[PDB]
From a paper:
The lpgD gene was identified by a targeted mutant screen, and the purified protein exhibited cation-dependent phosphodiesterase activity converting LPG to a cyclic-lysophosphatidic acid (cLPA) intermediate that is hydrolyzed to lysophosphatidic acid (LPA). The 2.1 Å crystal structure shows LpgD adopts the canonical glycerophosphodiester phosphodiesterase (GDPD) TIM barrel fold except for the positioning and length of helix α6 and sheet β7 that create a hydrophobic docking platform for the LPG acyl chain. The specific physiological function of LpgD in S. aureus is to re-cycle LPG into the PG biosynthetic pathway at the LPA acyltransferase step to maintain membrane PG molecular species homeostasis.
Residue numbers in the entry: 36 to 310
Amino acid sequence: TIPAFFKGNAPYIFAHRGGMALRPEQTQLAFDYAKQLGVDGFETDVRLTKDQQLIVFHDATVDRTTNGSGKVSAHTLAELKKLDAAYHFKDINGLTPYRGHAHTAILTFDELLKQYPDMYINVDLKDAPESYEGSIAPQIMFDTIAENQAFDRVLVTSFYKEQIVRFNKIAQGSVAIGASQQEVTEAFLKYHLLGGRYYQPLAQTFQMPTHFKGIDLTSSRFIKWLNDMNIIPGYYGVNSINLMNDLYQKGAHTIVTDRPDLAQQFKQTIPNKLE
Ligand SMILES: O=P([O-])(O)O
């Protein structure tokens, strides 16, 4: 029943929002470029529309990344799809080279699964649990995963523990889920109480920053401790090849990078038999 999400012996490299540093975030121009650059999958976010259809989108409003205005929850999928999701992407020249071009449109989570059936999906449920969109999003998320037979290649996480709570009750543990911050805090507590005898019963991915308020979280003993706790350690914001090799040798299993170009370089270093 447990999903075999992690296969092989090489850590998965994810492009942050499809590789937002090089191409407009959440657009096909980004997913195509990152996939060409040799990434293992896409880190992404989902928002629910008025049609109750999940779209690949980060902000609650389309103002930052499109030519439109307003919340995604107030727009239809048809209205959202007339917008240019590359309208505000600027290169270092100051130009917007992808404004008005093809493949600059918003995508639904359904079309993302059908179009890239070989990529791993690390998806974030963004809508708050208190909201109306957040109540029905976990179910719609599972239905989309279920309709595309992608139980073993999608990782559903959230900043809110309750969204992971509500997705996991529907998914029956048939889809890998991210670890909440409260669950890790109470994992450390049951460790000190029960000694090293404790481990988490179900493996969950805990994605971390490489640094937080001056505190380095790349300690080899911390990564080893998490693995001994049966907590799968991962890191986002990894934008150098030496840090990628460092986390790979310490035991991290997921890497989210804004720079998908380094993924191809990382893969050349590792052997093909590990995959
Ligand atoms: O997609 P992120 O920016 O919420 O990690």
